[PDB]
């Protein structure tokens, strides 16, 4: 896997 | 953003 | 076997 | 990724 600090999907 | 052919999240 | 939802080969 | 000694897909 994840990126973005928002878990899976959302911001990469 | 997306990757994997399954849209957002899931497989990168 | 297959994996990945794309049949044989490709994504495991 | 591959397995089987036959490259991508085929035998895992
Ligand atoms: C592929 C290299 C970077 C990476 C793991 C993106 C996946 O991020 P997510 O959409 O937040 O799950
Ligand atoms: C950098 C590669 C990238 C945009 C990963 C995000 O892929 P997703 O988790 O399928 O949305
Ligand atoms: C052990 C997991 C397994 C059967 C992988 C083979 O996946 P494929 O390359 O998508 O055919
Ligand atoms: C997933 C762990 C084993 C693995 C990488 C299977 C993929 O093998 P292939 O279908 O020969 O490409
Ligand atoms: Ca992810
Ligand atoms: Ca994310
Ligand atoms: Ca995405
Ligand atoms: Ca995806
Ligand atoms: Ca297979
Ligand atoms: Ca596959
Ligand atoms: Ca493979
Ligand atoms: Ca193989
Ligand atoms: Cl997609
Ligand atoms: Cl499949």
Ramachandran area for residue C6 (φ above 0: left; ψ -120 to 50: alpha; else beta): alpha
CA of A6 to the centre of ligand 14 (A): 29
- Check pocket membership of B5 for ligand 2, CB cut-off 6 A: no
Resolution for the entry shown, Å: 1.3
Q: How far apart are CA D9 and CA C6, in angstroms?
A: 11
Please list, in sequence order, all residues whose beta carbon lies within 8 angstroms of the beta carbon of residue D4, skipping any fewer than 6 positions away: D10, D11, D12
Ramachandran area for residue A11 (φ above 0: left; ψ -120 to 50: alpha; else beta): beta
Give C7's contacts in chain B (Cβ within 8 Å): none
Please list, in sequence order, all residues whose beta carbon lies within 8 angstroms of the beta carbon of residue C2, skipping any fewer than 6 positions away: C8
Q: How far apart are CA A12 and CA C2, in angstroms?
A: 27
Q: How far apart are CA B9 and CA C7, in angstroms?
A: 20
């Amino acid at each position: 896997x994840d990126a973005x600090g928002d878990g899976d999907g959302x911001i990469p």
